[PDB]
């Protein structure tokens, strides 16, 4: 599924992320807007390390879901990678919500520093009604 601004914005808001380990709603849009473009079965394969990000958050099976195929990973939301690529986000936010509980928080995804970090993010959420 390709999300609408404003629908994916309410979505979040309703699951919880507004505010999650400090992280603003406006910076999660900036997020899957960047890693995405607000699609749930983007599938991106880094041919450099063997791992594959999956879903609308671009998560990588290194460490965070199971595709078997990648070598010497870790499952750690406890997920099957299929599960990050259903229309329903469910899933994708309840991992999402397991990588900010890092030390690194947002900061995971390289491209939150690059596109969102220090930048007015008010845009991704105006006029949604969150």
């Given at each position: 599924?390709?999300?609408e601004r ?8 309703r699951?919880?992320?507004?505010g ?11 997020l ?6 607000y ?8 041919a450099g ?8 958050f671009?998560?990588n099976?290194?460490?965070?879901c199971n595709?078997g ?8 939301c406890?997920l099957?990678?299929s ?6 986000i ?8 397991r ?8 900061r ?6 690059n596109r ?5 993010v ?5 006029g949604?009604?969150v």
């Open positions: 599924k390709v999300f404003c629908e994916l914005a309410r979505t979040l808001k699951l919880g992320m507004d999650y380990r400090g992280i603003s709603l406006a910076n999660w849009m900036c899957a807007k960047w890693e995405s473009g699609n749930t079965r983007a599938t991106n394969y880094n390390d063997r791992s594959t990000d999956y879903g609308i671009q998560i099976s290194r460490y965070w595709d195929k990648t070598p010497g990973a870790v499952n750690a406890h099957s990678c599960a990050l690529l259903q229309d329903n469910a899933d994708a936010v309840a991992c999402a919500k990588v900010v509980r890092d030390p690194q928080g947002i995971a995804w390289p491209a939150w520093r969102c970090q220090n930048r007015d008010r845009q991704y959420v105006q949604c009604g």
